[PDB]
Amino acid sequence: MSRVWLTGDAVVDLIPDGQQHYLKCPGGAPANVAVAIARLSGRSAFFGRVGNDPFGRFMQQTLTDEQVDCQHLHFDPVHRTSTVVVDLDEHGERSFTFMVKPSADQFLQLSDIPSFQKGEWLHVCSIALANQPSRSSTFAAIAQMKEVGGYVSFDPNLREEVWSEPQELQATVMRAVGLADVVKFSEEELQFLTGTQSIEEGLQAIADFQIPLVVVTLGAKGALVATPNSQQIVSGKAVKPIDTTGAGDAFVGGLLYRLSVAQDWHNQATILDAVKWANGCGALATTQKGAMTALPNQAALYAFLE
Amino acid sequence: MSRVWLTGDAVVDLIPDGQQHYLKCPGGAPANVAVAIARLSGRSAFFGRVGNDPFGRFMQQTLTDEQVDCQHLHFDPVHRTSTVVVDLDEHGERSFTFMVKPSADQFLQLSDIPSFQKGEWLHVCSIALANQPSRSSTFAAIAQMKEVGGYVSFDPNLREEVWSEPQELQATVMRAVGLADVVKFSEEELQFLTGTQSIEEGLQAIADFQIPLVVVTLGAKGALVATPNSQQIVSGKAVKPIDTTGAGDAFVGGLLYRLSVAQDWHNQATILDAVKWANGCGALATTQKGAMTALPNQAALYAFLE
Ligand SMILES: Nc1ncnc2c1ncn2[C@@H]1O[C@H](COP(=O)(O)OP(=O)(O)O)[C@@H](O)[C@H]1O
Ligand SMILES: Nc1ncnc2c1ncn2[C@@H]1O[C@H](COP(=O)(O)OP(=O)(O)O)[C@@H](O)[C@H]1O
Ligand SMILES: OC[C@H]1O[C@](O)(CO)[C@@H](O)[C@@H]1O
Ligand SMILES: OC[C@H]1O[C@](O)(CO)[C@@H](O)[C@@H]1O
Ligand code: BEF
Ligand code: BEF
Ligand SMILES: [Ca+2]
Ligand SMILES: [Ca+2]
Ligand code: NA
Ligand code: NA
């Protein structure tokens, strides 16, 4: 069972629950992925910075509770933990307002990067690339994982408002796309990043990247899986979402859990099965408010997939 | 009825209400004072900056609902509205964690200051002095109110963590104390700012400021009122607080409401009556969670004072 490293932003998502209240929900895409993997009995570890504040300590506690290795989660001395307000009438990027800019995670330093080993995974989202020093630190982490013979997963997970220089987003994100073994886009993100109007055109636009595995999520319709000379839609049972927050991260968690335990993750059968798990995780994640709340264990996932 | 201008930070206070929820409560000391005055049928107006975000719009809506003039509440183009997490096991400064530093209000500019007129009041708290440009803008506003023949009220309302240079707090706050007609301290703040161990010693330490009216709040014991050659404790009925958040601002609101409608606020009878109102407001404010929730109207206050 290969270790999956997650890095980036652990955040508190404030999610409406009644007209005058927010639920205090643990979140942050790479933290969500870490917990998704752990819930499936995988080996996940998180490195990054939160703030020395109650929200940062709450995220440390959450990762601890969830059996995610968080020895390399540090408290920044000055900056605050990311705090995000969710609007449930919107979906994805449009649903979030980032109250802390730049939050502690944006100050990831080179010395925060842990030792990597051959065969490990590193998963990254674009918020880690939004501002310096995290951007350069995260690119260094990617280069180090590649050098040691590990694998790199990237989910742009675009949140434009976090970028102090939003005009840098497209190029910076595409630089990371070019480094990854696995890239997951939503349909909308693929089109945005490539300036195209369809998935077909978006996939053609990234062909010269020779990305080993691209997955494009299609909401209730599942996911398009693109590997060399092959495209295939993989879909499971559609559900009516209660909260879509983090469904994409649950998806990545199932995907990477299955790739991480595979003898040879490049194998087409392994990939398609991993995407079946991913779709089931994404569906189940939507059944409760909070990105992490309904991240399934294997008993729940197997029951749903049957 | 003289207009009272309030400036500084309008904030969203996230107040625990159940183990997994926060109440979304409008707050921010000068906003609290503005609303307290308005609830008592006074003429209050707020100038300052919040963020172009849901919390900033919520604070605009709150001031609007409360009949506080907020024509001069602006949305900063870049910075976020102050967001504060409250710990109900603590009191005052120790109960707050500021998640947004620097928030929008810290970017108050000289051009944000509205036109003042003779006999108006301006009330300020120390967060407005914490960082530039708000610090210099607020000192300019104070100088302008003094020049036109208005009156200046200052409540340090210390929140050290908001200062990027906390070593500047003492001197900067005492500079404002030297400009004010009315200064309200908690017992703890007076001692901290003067480096003393008693109210008596603290009052002696500020004697050469020749401050026309100093009020030192004493929690359930009421307030010490210090005017030239006179000190007097004014107390009302003690209550068991449900939430002390903003009790001090309710106090200031009652005080300034009564001074603002007085023919001659310097009159000793007027001052002592204003403090009686202040104590009643402070007590009643504690009866519900949220700084603004239980700010009384006159019917409630009169009933309580009887
Ligand atoms: N209505 C749905 N029914 C079943 N699965 C869904 C549904 N919506 C999303 N999913 C699953 O979640 C994945 C990602 O969708 P998405 O909502 O974009 O994630 P997120 O909201 O976290 O950004 C899909 O590929 C799919 O597996
Ligand atoms: N337990 C209490 N009973 C009655 N009045 C109180 C009580 N606590 C506070 N007050 C009133 O509120 C005023 C300020 O107290 P304080 O709690 O320090 O305000 P804040 O919590 O907003 O900083 C007192 O001067 C008094 O008028
Ligand atoms: O993917 C969902 C997650 O992404 C974020 O917007 C940024 O990391 C979080 O607020 C949320 O939990
Ligand atoms: O005085 C109470 C108020 O002071 C603040 O801490 C800062 O303005 C707010 O969080 C609260 O409403
Ligand atoms: F970005 Be998804 F909501 F995880
Ligand atoms: F600072 Be007090 F709680 F208004
Ligand atoms: Ca996503
Ligand atoms: Ca106070
Ligand atoms: Na959920
Ligand atoms: Na209250």
UniProtKB/TrEMBL annotation, chains A, B:
- Residues the entry annotates as binding ADP 2: 184, 217, 219, 222, 239, 279
State the superkingdom.
Bacteria
Q: Which UniProt keywords apply?
A: ATP-binding, Calcium, Kinase, Metal-binding, Nucleotide-binding, Transferase
Which GO biological process categories is it annotated with?
Answer: fructose metabolic process
Binding-site residues for Ca(2+), renumbered to this chain: 157
Molecular function (GO) terms listed? ATP binding; fructokinase activity; metal ion binding
Q: Binding residues for ADP 1, per the UniProt record?
A: 91, 222, 239, 246-248, 279
Ranges where the Carbohydrate kinase PfkB domain occurs: 8-297
| Residues holding beta-D-fructose | 9, 13, 28-29, 32, 159, 249
- EC number(s) for this protein? 2.7.1.4
InterPro entries recorded: Carboh/pur_kinase_PfkB_CS, PfkB_Carbo_kinase, PfkB_dom, Ribo/fructo_kinase, Ribokinase-like
The keyword Nucleotide-binding is assigned to this record = yes
EC class (word):
transferase
State the Pfam families in the record: PfkB (PF00294)
Q: Which residues does UniProt call coiled coil?
A: none
Q: Which family does it belong to?
A: Belongs to the carbohydrate kinase PfkB family.
The protein's name: Fructokinase
Can you name the source organism? Vibrio cholerae serotype O1 (strain ATCC 39541 / Classical Ogawa 395 / O395)
Upper classification of the organism: Bacteria, Pseudomonadati, Pseudomonadota, Gammaproteobacteria, Vibrionales
